[PDB]
Amino acid sequence: SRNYLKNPGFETGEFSPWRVSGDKKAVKVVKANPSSNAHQGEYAVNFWLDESFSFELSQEVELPAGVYRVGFWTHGEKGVKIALKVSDYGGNERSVEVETTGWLEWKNPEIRNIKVETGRIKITVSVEGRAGDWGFIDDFYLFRE
Numbered sequence: 001s002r003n004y005l006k007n008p009g010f011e012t013g014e015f016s017p018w019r020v021s022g023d024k025k026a027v028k029v030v031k032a033n034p035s036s037n038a039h040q041g042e043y044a045v046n047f048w049l050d051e052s053f054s055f056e057l058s059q060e061v062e063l064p065a066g067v068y069r070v071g072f073w074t075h076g077e078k079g080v081k082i083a084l085k086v087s088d089y090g091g092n093e094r095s096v097e098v099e100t101t102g103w104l105e106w107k108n109p110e111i112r113n114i115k116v117e118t119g120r121i122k123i124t125v126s127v128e129g130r131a132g133d134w135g136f137i138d139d140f141y142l143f144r145e
């Protein structure tokens with residue numbers, strides 16, 4: 001249960017060391033109100049904009065060789081396109097795609113059986129929304145299997 005991602009729940013109230021790329025103004029760390037918008041703790045990433053938007057959240061990690069799994073938790077407006085990607089670990093990029101389906105309909109994208117041979121991994125989440133779309137991202141984990 002040791003989690004290899006830093007600030008995996010945004011509980012500092014800030015992004016660091018997660019990088020935000022793309023339409024940054026679409027994405028914030030917020031103190032969830034109601035708290036149910038977060039999956040753990042008090043804070044979550046919330047995205048929203050009044051026009052269409054795309055962004056990515058990423059973090060790179062140095063890790064012991066081993067087999068790992070990565071995932072997180074999300075919910076939001078019906079039809080927002082979210083992808084989880086892992087790269088730089090030794091193999092080709094792996095991904096999984098999910099769409100949100102409404103408020104508090106939690107999704108748990110996950111990638112398992114990731115054989116880290118480079119001593120590194122990069123975790124990227126991509127979000128693509130239409131005008132007015134929104135959602136929450138929280139509670140990342142990178143575990144050794």
Ligand SMILES: OC[C@H]1O[C@@H](O[C@@H]2[C@H](O)[C@@H](O)[C@H](O[C@@H]3[C@H](O)[C@@H](O)[C@H](O)O[C@@H]3CO)O[C@@H]2CO)[C@H](O)[C@@H](O)[C@H]1O
Nearest residue numbers: 028033034037046047048049102103132133134135136
């Ligand atoms: O079931 C409806 C849900 O709406 C959510 O609200 C969405 C976003 O999560 C929220 O960020 C956004 O709010 C805008 C902006 O970010 C905020 O600072 C400002 O005060 O209001 C803006 C909207 O006018 O609103 C969208 C919905 O439009 C709630 O997060 C969720 O709890 C739930 O009510």
Ligand SMILES: [Ca+2]
Nearest residue numbers: 009040041043
């Ligand atoms: Ca949290």
